[PDB]
Curated annotation (Swiss-Prot), chain B:
This is Minichromosome maintenance protein 5. It catalyses: ATP + H2O = ADP + phosphate + H(+). A motif (Arginine finger) lies at residues 437-440. The keyword Lyase does not apply. InterPro entries: MCM, MCM5, MCM5_C, MCM_CS, MCM_dom, MCM_lid, MCM_N, MCM_OB. SUPFAM superfamilies: Nucleic acid-binding proteins (SSF50249), P-loop containing nucleoside triphosphate hydrolases (SSF52540). It is found in: Nucleus. GO terms for cellular component: chromosome, telomeric region; CMG complex; cytoplasm; DNA replication preinitiation complex; MCM complex; nuclear pre-replicative complex; nuclear replication fork; nucleoplasm. Acts as a component of the MCM2-7 complex (MCM complex) which is the putative replicative helicase essential for 'once per cell cycle' DNA replication initiation and elongation in eukaryotic cells. The active ATPase sites in the MCM2-7 ring are formed through the interaction surfaces of two neighboring subunits such that a critical structure of a conserved arginine finger motif is provided in trans relative to the ATP-binding site of the Walker A box of the adjacent subunit. Residues 255-462 form the MCM domain. The gene is MCM5. PANTHER family: DNA REPLICATION LICENSING FACTOR MCM FAMILY MEMBER, DNA REPLICATION LICENSING FACTOR MCM5. Belongs to the MCM family. Pfam families: MCM, MCM5_C, MCM_lid, MCM_N, MCM_OB.
Swiss-Prot record, chain D:
This is DNA replication licensing factor MCM2. The chain holds residues 773 to 864 of 868 of the full protein. It comes from the Eukaryota. Belongs to the MCM family. Acts as a component of the MCM2-7 complex (MCM complex) which is the putative replicative helicase essential for 'once per cell cycle' DNA replication initiation and elongation in eukaryotic cells. The active ATPase sites in the MCM2-7 ring are formed through the interaction surfaces of two neighboring subunits such that a critical structure of a conserved arginine finger motif is provided in trans relative to the ATP-binding site of the Walker A box of the adjacent subunit. It is found in: Nucleus. Component of the MCM2-7 complex. The complex forms a toroidal hexameric ring with the proposed subunit order MCM2-MCM6-MCM4-MCM7-MCM3-MCM5; loaded onto DNA, forms a head-head double hexamer. Present with 1690 molecules/cell in log phase SD medium.
Amino acid sequence: FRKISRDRGIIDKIISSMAPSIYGHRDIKTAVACSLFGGVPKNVNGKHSIRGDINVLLLGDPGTAKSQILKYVEKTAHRAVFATGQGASAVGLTAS
Amino acid sequence: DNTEIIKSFKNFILEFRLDSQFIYRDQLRNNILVKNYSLTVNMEHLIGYNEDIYKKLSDEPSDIIPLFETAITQVAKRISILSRPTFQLILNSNANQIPLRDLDSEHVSKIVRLSGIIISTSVLSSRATYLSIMCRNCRHTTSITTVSLPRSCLSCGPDPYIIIHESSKFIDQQFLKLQEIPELVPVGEMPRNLTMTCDRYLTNKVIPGTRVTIVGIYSIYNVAIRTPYIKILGIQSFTEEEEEEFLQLSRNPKLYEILTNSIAPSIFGNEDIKKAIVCLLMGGSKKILPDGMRLRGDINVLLLGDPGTAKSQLLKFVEKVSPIAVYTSGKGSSAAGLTASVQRDPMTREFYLEGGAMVLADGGVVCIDEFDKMRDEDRVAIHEAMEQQTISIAKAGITTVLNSRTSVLAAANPIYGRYDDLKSPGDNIDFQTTILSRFDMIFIVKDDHNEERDISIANHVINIHTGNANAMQNQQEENGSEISIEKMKRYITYCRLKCAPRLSPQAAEKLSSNFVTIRKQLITIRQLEAIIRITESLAKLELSPIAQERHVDEAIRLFQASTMDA
Amino acid sequence: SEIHVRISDFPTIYSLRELRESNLSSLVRVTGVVTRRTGVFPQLYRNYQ
Amino acid sequence: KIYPKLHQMDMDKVSRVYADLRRESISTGSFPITVRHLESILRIAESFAKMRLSEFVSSYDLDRAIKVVVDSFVDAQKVSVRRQLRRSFAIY
Ligand SMILES: Nc1ncnc2c1ncn2[C@@H]1O[C@H](COP(=O)(O)OP(=O)(O)O)[C@@H](O)[C@H]1O
Ligand SMILES: Nc1ncnc2c1ncn2[C@@H]1O[C@H](COP(=O)(O)OP(=O)(O)O)[C@@H](O)[C@H]1O
Ligand SMILES: [Zn+2]
């Protein structure tokens, strides 16, 4: 890990390795890459907290593999939970 | 042995003196004249008369406090002889109320002192205190004073006894729910709710949403599931130096500006918004006309804000400053739909009246977040409460009216991405225009692009992300730019309790001239009351006996900055 | 009154799909996610959950 | 393992771009730049540093962090406003 961490173009190797069999859409691939690594959460005592999670919205015309990206994120991420807008319910998301 | 205990309490009541009066005997005599069988005894006098009887009561009240109730019944009977049922004893104490988080197994069955707010009350129920029974087999008659009937006759088979109803006595019981004061509620923690039961004349003395002091008997009743409760024994609901401190502070000419800056120092700009919040916290004045018209003293303010304008922080800061404040967001309230409700508690299997967020804040302030996305039917109850200060609830065959004298701090998002000055607020704000007609003053917090403001805000973000914000608190305190939040909360309660201003004739004629000239250019008669409430708000801050015409200029300007903002 | 022993770093690890019948009445180590959790109540007393 | 931290040396690089971005918001476009955008820039800046397994935020990571957030904000605008903003932010 330390060896690759200091290699040339480490950020470009990461982004170009997001979804290898998807062409272009590099502004999404860089957005997918950043959402996987995430930020650093902060909690100031006696004040409110700050989230470190990165939120991505993929809006596009039919095609463009928006769904296949979420299928690639499901397998690569450590703990991935997949949901669908119509197949989910208010109880099925919050609690039972 | 127990006769000495009875005698000791008998001498204690008959002979204790305070203010040259035998207060416990006199008040019992007064209760007999009033024909109510109740007595109140202060624990701080019990220890003074004799520590031994106090120590016994504190250690084993299970059987000793029945003895006290029987002893005073004898005392009352003796008193009735001189003038020619089982009486109740109420305990009051001034000792420290141990936090509800601190009670442990070592205090089980011991006398404990607690404090909290009453969130729910149940319906009355009948309980037995004296019974007469008869054997079905041999007709043997006897009397009995969890008690159970004998399994064998005392003169017949198993369980031979039946109850004679026309020769028995019964008492009333009420179950209540209490939770700790919000001033001590930890962050990310649900406040500890507590089950409390009271009987005889202690019933129906309080309503949900009442702050009280509790003296009672902490106990537990029934893999081994157990549930605690308190047998209620008694319920109770400023320093000279602090009084003179604020009295001197009343003569300070810069108090208005000092208080204004202390309102959320971490936020930039919006100075007049801070003044409005102070007027919201100070509030107006309520008066009653002989013809049945009651004048609302509460002041409600709406803060229409664009996204990212720190609208969440504006309401968040107010809750910690106002002594009586509750935060609501996304239809979320104190386990209710912002209003009162009737729910069944399965523990006692009884039905309970439960107070909502607007119920708990009677006489205080409520913070409403996400106002544009609430339930419409909730708005109707809010609409009535915003004007008549009452909430109406109907259940089966009964309709009940509940008082809510609460000022409302509200924040909302416009219909579009940003308020457009070309349109009336009724076509820009994303909820019912009827509610828009009810707010006293609405402000549009702005996001005008400015170099030094944005840069100062921008650096503030990195300071938090670098942890330097903690050092900023010391720097701001050293600058003397803020009054202590606890002291300001004390001041708000102080002014709300000590001052009630009235308008001066010069201010009234000044208001009349302003109102006529405004309508000559153009505002409704309803908003005349809204402006006048501000005039009483400024005078209350200064604790002046009457309002003054010098309060009018700021009052008009702040309202002008509100209504003409839209 | 008692000293309940806490074992640590037990080497053999099983998943929720590997719990064979032969593993009954034996010490096992598994890993998972906390979905449902009950309250704290005494048991015939000492705490139970 | 990695929890990269900020350097106050980059405060100027962050604040000046934000004020420049804010100035163009009132100049052209209907979308007002909000503080949450700046909060988004720091988060993605930290994520870029976390990619290199470096405990401190570098200037290079901030440049790419500024590029992503500005590009998304520009691309979401209408066509008439979109072309004006692309020329104003050619440096970024
Ligand atoms: N940009 C792209 N490059 C390569 N293949 C693509 C691309 N966009 C779509 N596809 C093909 O289309 C399929 C994805 O379709 P789909 O997931 O339905 O897109 P969406 O759900 O966003 O409409 C994939 O099997 C992929 O092979
Ligand atoms: N004048 C200001 N002073 C201090 N912080 C500000 C100011 N204006 C904006 N902010 C920052 O912008 C953020 C606004 O977020 P917020 O308004 O709570 O989001 P939302 O609009 O979704 O409620 C806050 O974190 C705050 O720190
Ligand atoms: Zn009999």
